[PDB]
Design a binder for this molecule. Structure first.
Ligand SMILES: *C(=O)[C@]1([C@@H](O)[C@@H]2C=CCCC2)NC(=O)[C@H](CC)[C@]1(C)O
Ligand SMILES: *C(=O)[C@]1([C@@H](O)[C@@H]2C=CCCC2)NC(=O)[C@H](CC)[C@]1(C)O
Ligand SMILES: *C(=O)[C@]1([C@@H](O)[C@@H]2C=CCCC2)NC(=O)[C@H](CC)[C@]1(C)O
Ligand SMILES: *C(=O)[C@]1([C@@H](O)[C@@H]2C=CCCC2)NC(=O)[C@H](CC)[C@]1(C)O
Ligand SMILES: *C(=O)[C@]1([C@@H](O)[C@@H]2C=CCCC2)NC(=O)[C@H](CC)[C@]1(C)O
Ligand SMILES: *C(=O)[C@]1([C@@H](O)[C@@H]2C=CCCC2)NC(=O)[C@H](CC)[C@]1(C)O
Ligand SMILES: *C(=O)[C@]1([C@@H](O)[C@@H]2C=CCCC2)NC(=O)[C@H](CC)[C@]1(C)O
Ligand SMILES: *C(=O)[C@]1([C@@H](O)[C@@H]2C=CCCC2)NC(=O)[C@H](CC)[C@]1(C)O
Lengths: 223, 222, 239, 222, 223, 222, 222, 222
């Protein structure tokens, strides 16, 4: 698994691979690992699928629940805290192998400066969180490969589209070096999924845009 | 890893993938796992990379050693026995994680009927061997996928070329389902290696022929 | 054990073998592993026999329970969630050798496009589920053999009968390679069971069509075996 | 695995199934488990395949080795003792999972009464042996089913052919109840192998004869 | 990690490095480990990030909670006891690898002599506390190097400014000998954080001030 | 520790960091980890220092020993085999926490094409070796960061100087992400060491050249 | 750690060292280990710092709590029992390494004979207590050294001042032989603390008096 | 234990504390840990006393043995290697708890520049050695304190006497923070021992010079 997230001027993008495995066996090729959790946030999760999925589903319900009860959404800091508490609650199970780690991306409508209102937050198994300041982050078995790739490509990020391209290329580098991360599948037409979030909210990136970027990356390296 | 071998009218073909890993990490993309061990035999090995390479190397030396000392090569049965003894000798080390399992393919110049002189032999960790009679075999983490694929494609094998095509497609199916087996890499131009053996001896299959077959398999599935 | 499920234009079919074992011993030859759980869904279970039967029985009760209480059946997504929660609830027991894994097949009456309303969903021990979209799935010790077989035969599925045939052939290939899966028993007349589900609902497939399909698969392999050889050599002859 | 042996008036018959497995997986369908070890004896072996084959191969060499060195074959009791010593020698390996148990069938040319010169001997992991006196014996995971079947069918053995039939039916019952034992495979035409030994020596039973008995048992149960 | 604290005439200073690691990997470069917990106290924490952060957050809430309920802030001794009880409460978890150890610095408004009203308190895993009487203390994997450095530099601490400079140099020595403690990062412009507390209260030291001190220390040792 | 090696047109460069640690403690700042082992080869080693230093020293003696005894140096393949055998010989100790892994760089004087005569070989704990074909390799705790960095920078390598620059930058990237790898120390004036090998032999890269490259990388990133 | 207590005509004195350690490291030099727990009692504690401090603090609160609620202080026997019960309550934690052992010294206002109203009570991990009647006692890693020293010096105790001198010299002897007990630190001017208790109540001994005695002991041994 | 060594213009000095312990108990106050091992070298050892003494004794014999046999002393590099091999030989025992680590100080008569001919070499449990390049080193439980102290005082070393003073002060700081290292004992008149080595050879520093330095350090800190 590999999930990446990066900030660009005016927003944030999060993308994830489609592979699921059982030991060495490829058991899934179209899993979606990045979810829009509310109008301004997306959650990507690595680790045990059952827990990962529950986290994303319960977390979206909890965010909207607060909103309906209180009339206003939680502040970004409050959203982070709720995710952290949810991860912390799974600590015992995690020690027993049901370990799941989310990566949170969002756009803070209340931030002072809009161009930098993008947010990336990582979490550890005990519920510790860290608001990323370096511009990008990644979780999963291919995360180190992805991060070392973004380290070299990040300077090319100037807007949402160059942001998305660097994210897809980082996932491509993760797949190139980590057999547990799925690369673009040209035969079946399956590609990484991605969410972009800016002042207008969180939106799924259309598969055809990702397909085009992936094919370009492949062609480019083919020579 | 996946190494396959299958028999076709007049000979045998053995093909192997190119991937090496360390845990989930892809650590190699061009490893050669199939070796010509003498004029009429090829060995493909799965398992611990260090042990596999050493088995193939020592085994070829042992075969030629006998030939130079005695003036004639070992009978095919003798070749099988030496490889089995070599595997048996690694049993202790294997239980400690140094396990390697070879797959042997050959053409028996002394067999009565030439069209069926092809031989495929598999081995277990204790040195047990079995001369295959169903037409094909495979070893490695992708072997079950490869064998289930060849079970459906084998009736198409009628000569060396259709044999080669089915072998490459079996490796393609193994890579499709086993993350530890490498599929054809069109970006880097790296494909499975293969050896064909018939009455004229063992010869490495040129990469261009495999690339061709691989692209046709991919085109067909898209 | 092997349970398979596959989608065909307009529906879905699920079929299961009949073997039960205790170690190497064959302890049962007529176990039924595929259940109609409601009018539009079937459940096939692999693993610990005791837990498997209980999951199917309790799940059917839970689906009907909701229907009687609320006046309407659960949406397909809700059916999936309930089965996932039930599996998750057995996680402790499963880590202690009581593990069971279900495979769910259904027809979604509320799906937009009827020809593809067929649904196949797999589950892992922790309750994780995945709606299958490659057309087929299988669970049990013979599942890898069944899936590799279906991978090569799936392009032949064009309707319910060809789908049934392919499912039976996949079970046949699983039994051919997995000693824990039972093949067709011609001496006793026992064959895999199957359920077909389409817009008119889930129905058990009659034993006689499955028996016919099975003998046809066997005669066909018998013929191919004689036609074939080992790179030219034939080591056995039928007599 | 299931190997059976039974005495009939004037000789003995030994038959074995063809299945090899690795966990639940069927890894082989034509394995031969019964060997003619010398002119008057056959050995069938169950357990670890590597070791089983070595035993049979080494044992035949040892019997013929004695014969060439001393000019005469070992007495039947001496043949038993050598086999026992070979099994005992594998005891450490066996406790480590490489356990193989042979079943020995023979015809004693030096026995006083020819009609009963047939011999069946079983062995345990420590090298203990027992000359069977009840008429039949079996080894392997399906042995209990085979023995209970022979217990009911043994009164039908009156000569070599009815003995061969009972042995095949015992293997059929073992496969019917033990998933590790292979039944007759009508699709592939593969059947249990058998060896018959009488005053004229040990001979392999032709496959066609076993196929016919197998079909009659199946028809009869159908 | 290294957190240092030292008393100077009239107050106290606490400074912390910015590194977070996962095994040998540097996983963070801008973590803040020193928090102002109330108007007159600061808490620096080493160990498990998740527990560390939760300690500081809950501790700040608990101190203000008492103040709002009772109308007056807790005495300094009461503040120490509350932190000790919180640490003790994590002992079972700590034995499971979730260990966190705080270092408390404060200014006691009720102390008789103002020049020495500065306070430094250390804590062990069982909730034991000790009010430091030798002028400085440190916690974390680089604490012994920091303390041995302050032992030689402490006589130079005559006021809050030289106290801040020494604190920075002790952290510099900790980073020089402990790979788990981060040194000043001149390329990215990231430096240790610090808090100064005197009769006017606790205040964050501006990063620019720390950067100047760090550059000066670096120039000096260069020759 | 991080040691990197990369091929450039006409040769090869190997560079290593200078840090040694004991747990979290920095215990050394000027360790040299890259050695010229003969006129055309360099060895860099990661792992337990006592064993690493021993391996480089013993290996250079072995290479020269052969040369003096036989009158000619070992072929490159033979040099690889000797290093592999030495590593294999330490396996028991390595499972005991004494593990050391070398990285070998060389220039093959007997290679057909001089521009590509550069060689990079990696080794695993069991003595398995692999001649690298992707152009670069790295060993040590910072190796993955270094390899990911070189993957993006490798296309800039057109000669020995750009090759050296990319190697230093890879080490810089390794130190930026791995606390166990030492970055350039501007205060003390200590920098990574490097060896360049081309048709004229292996020569140590002067510290001043490395220092200029390091400063340029630092200025570039700030 | 070392805490000593001894009876003198008319009262009792308790004194403790100032060292705290973490393994071999000296982590503290001014810890106070002897507390006045009520007007007529002092408690000194050895073992886990966290537990010892909590024992002294909770115990003082419990004694005064009883006094305020009931209007009169607990009898000396009651005070002993409360401390024993508190120690017993820590048993589980103590078996887990959180072990602390108190030493209690007091003056019993209700005793018949005032010259001997001094009391010293020791405690074990399970809450067992013992009223010491031999004149002195000590707890901590240096206690055996302190007791053997007091055994030889005790006959010199004739009043409060000589009692104080013997206590300080016993702590001196403990520090002389036990690296975990701190000696008088002349450089920093830190000395053992002490509490004296007689008919007028418990009072802290001024540091200057202890420093004086310590200097005299050192002069004497020089 | 703490043993320090530092280079000064023209030579080197090595000094060690005098304490030996058994658990928390001080079991010795006058142990000598620094030995002159030949005319130009001194060895200081920490760890298990039995093994430490054996090392110093055996090593001095080995150095002189070579000299008598070959007519010339070993080069400094050879002396290092011999000590390393001796340490490596104790690795199995060290794992079992008999761990001893030497620190080597010497003056290399064959060095090009005399003012810097001083040498300091440290060793790890596996026999790994490192020629110190930053001016000083220390071994033992108080070594980190001693090194952090020398890091601040080293710029004061300008000759043999200031180097000896700084070495004594570093040992004083080690004793101040490590209960296992002995400080100057003014009551008994026992101080750290030291060896100075320059072009004229290794000589023991007279106790009176060390006593004066120690008393001055103590008064200074008072
Ligand atoms: C990824 O972390 C991975 C996925 O299978 C899993 C599936 C769906 C969404 C959550 C992530 N988890 C694992 O355990 C695999 C094995 C290493 C995986 C492919 O990495
Ligand atoms: C295959 O068996 C595999 C290869 O890495 C290895 C490399 C070279 C030749 C021998 C075979 N061995 C392993 O351990 C991997 C993980 C399961 C592998 C990719 O399958
Ligand atoms: C299959 O999964 C299998 C069946 O015995 C069992 C029986 C009835 C319904 C649920 C499935 N379960 C087992 O434990 C056997 C051994 C691996 C089995 C035949 O596979
Ligand atoms: C039988 O004993 C069996 C055979 O696989 C084996 C193969 C060839 C000749 C010797 C016997 N051994 C096993 O381990 C299997 C599983 C228990 C087996 C099928 O019973
Ligand atoms: C420090 O103690 C350290 C920090 O990562 C951690 C991070 C943020 C605030 C609390 C302290 N904790 C650890 O576990 C690391 C291990 C080497 C650390 C760098 O020392
Ligand atoms: C590197 O591999 C490293 C070095 O300390 C060591 C020292 C000198 C030359 C050989 C390599 N070895 C280790 O054990 C450290 C910790 C993982 C190290 C810094 O990486
Ligand atoms: C003494 O018992 C000792 C002290 O550190 C401790 C500190 C303050 C008051 C209670 C006693 N406790 C220990 O664990 C040390 C090690 C043996 C100690 C110095 O003896
Ligand atoms: C020091 O290393 C130490 C000494 O007792 C010992 C004695 C004589 C010369 C060799 C060194 N070794 C130990 O085991 C003690 C306790 C940890 C010691 C005081 O440190």
């Amino acid at each position: 698994t590999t999930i990446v997230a990066l900030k660009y001027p005016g927003g944030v993008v999060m993308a994830g691979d489609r592979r699921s495995t059982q030991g060495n066996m490829i058991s899934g090729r179209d899993v979606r690992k990045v979810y829009i959790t509310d109008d301004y946030t997306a959650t990507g999760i690595a680790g045990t699928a059952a827990v990962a999925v529950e986290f994303a589903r319960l977390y979206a319900v909890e965010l909207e629940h607060y909103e309906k009860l209180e009339g206003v959404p939680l502040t970004f800091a409050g959203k982070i805290n709720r995710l952290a508490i949810m991860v912390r609650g799974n600590l015992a199970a995690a020690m027993q192998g049901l370990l799941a780690l989310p990566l949170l991306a969002g756009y803070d409508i209340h931030a002072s400066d809009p161009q930098s209102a993008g947010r990336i937050v990582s979490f550890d198994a005990a519920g510790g969180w860290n608001i990323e300041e370096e511009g990008y982050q990644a979780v999963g078995s291919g995360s180190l490969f992805a991060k070392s790739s973004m380290k070299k490509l990040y300077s090319q990020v100037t807007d949402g589209d160059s942001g998305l391209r660097v994210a897809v290329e980082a996932l491509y580098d993760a797949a190139d070096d980590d057999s547990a991360t799925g690369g673009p599948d040209l035969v079946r037409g399956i590609f990484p999924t991605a969410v972009i979030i800016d002042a207008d909210g969180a939106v799924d990136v259309p598969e055809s845009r990702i397909a085009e970027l992936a094919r370009a990356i492949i062609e480019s390296r083919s020579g």
